Amino acid sequence: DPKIVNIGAVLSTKKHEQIFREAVNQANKRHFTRKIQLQATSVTHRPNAIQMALSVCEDLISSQVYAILVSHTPTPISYTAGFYRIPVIGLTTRMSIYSDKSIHLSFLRTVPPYSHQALVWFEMMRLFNWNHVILIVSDDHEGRAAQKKLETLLEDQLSYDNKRGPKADKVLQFEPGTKNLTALLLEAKELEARVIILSASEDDATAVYKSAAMLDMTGAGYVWLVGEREISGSALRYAPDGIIGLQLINGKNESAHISDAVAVVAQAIHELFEMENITDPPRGCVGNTNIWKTGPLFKRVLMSSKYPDGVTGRIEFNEDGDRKFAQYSIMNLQNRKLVQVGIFNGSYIIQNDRKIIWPGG
Ligand X SMILES: *[C@@H]1O[C@H](CO)[C@@H](O[C@@H]2O[C@H](CO)[C@@H](O[C@@H]3O[C@H](CO)[C@@H](O)[C@H](O)[C@@H]3O)[C@H](O)[C@H]2NC(C)=O)[C@H](O)[C@H]1NC(C)=O
Residues that bind ligand NAG (CB under 6 A): 253, 255-256, 259, 276-277, 311
Instruction: Output the CA torsion 128→155→201→316 (10° steps).
Output: 90
Nearer to ligand X, 273 or 348 (CB): 348
Closest CB to ligand X among 293 and 314?
314
Question: Applying CB under 5 A, which part among 101-109, 171-179, 260-268, 334-342 lies near K ion?
Answer: 101-109
Q: Which is nearer to K ion, 38 or 69 (CB)?
A: 69
352 binds ligand X (CB under 6 A): no
Cβ nearer to ligand NAG, comparing 17 with 204? 17
CA distances, 293 to each of 84, 103, 121, 197, 224 (Å): 9, 19, 42, 45, 49
The answer to the question of residue 346 lying near ligand X (CB under 6 A) is yes
Interacting residue with ligand X among 33, 234, 340, 347 (CB under 6 A): 347
Q: Does 123 bind ligand X (CB under 6 A)?
A: no
Minimum distance, C-beta of residue 55 to K ion, in the bound complex (Å): 23
The DSSP result for 231-280, as a single string, is GSGGGGSSPPTT-EEEEETTTT-HHHHHHHHHHHHHHHHHHHTTSSS--P
Q: Which residues pair with 331 in a beta bridge?
A: 245, 340
Q: Which amino acid is at 309?
A: D
**CB of residue 136 to ligand X, shortest distance in Å:** 29
**Does 104 engage in binding with K ion (CB under 5 A)?**
yes
Strands 337-344 and 328-334: antiparallel
- Whose CA is closest to 42, among 56, 31, 26, 28? 56
Residues 248-287 that bind ligand X (CB under 6 A): none
277 interface partner picked from ligand NAG, K ion, ligand X, none, CB below 5 to 8 A per type? ligand NAG
**197 or 256, CB closer to ligand NAG?**
256
Nearest residue to ligand X on Cβ basis: 345
Contacts of 169 (CB under 8 A, 6+ apart): 132, 133, 134, 191, 192, 193
Strands (E), the chain: 3-11, 36-44, 65-70, 88-90, 107-109, 132-138, 167-174, 195-199, 223-226, 244-248, 307-310, 313-315, 328-334, 337-344, 349-351
CB of 328 to ligand X, least distance (A): 12
Choose one: 50-58, 179-187, 282-290, 342-350; the region binding ligand X (CB under 6 A). 342-350
Number of residues forming the site for K ion (CB under 5 A): 1
**Does residue 345 belong to the site contacting ligand X (CB under 6 A)?**
yes
Question: How far apart (Å, rounded) are the C-alpha atoms in residues 259 and 16?
Answer: 10
* Number of residues near ligand X (by CB under 6 A): 4
Residues at the interface with K ion (CB under 5 A) = 104
Residues at the interface with ligand X (CB under 6 A) = 345-348
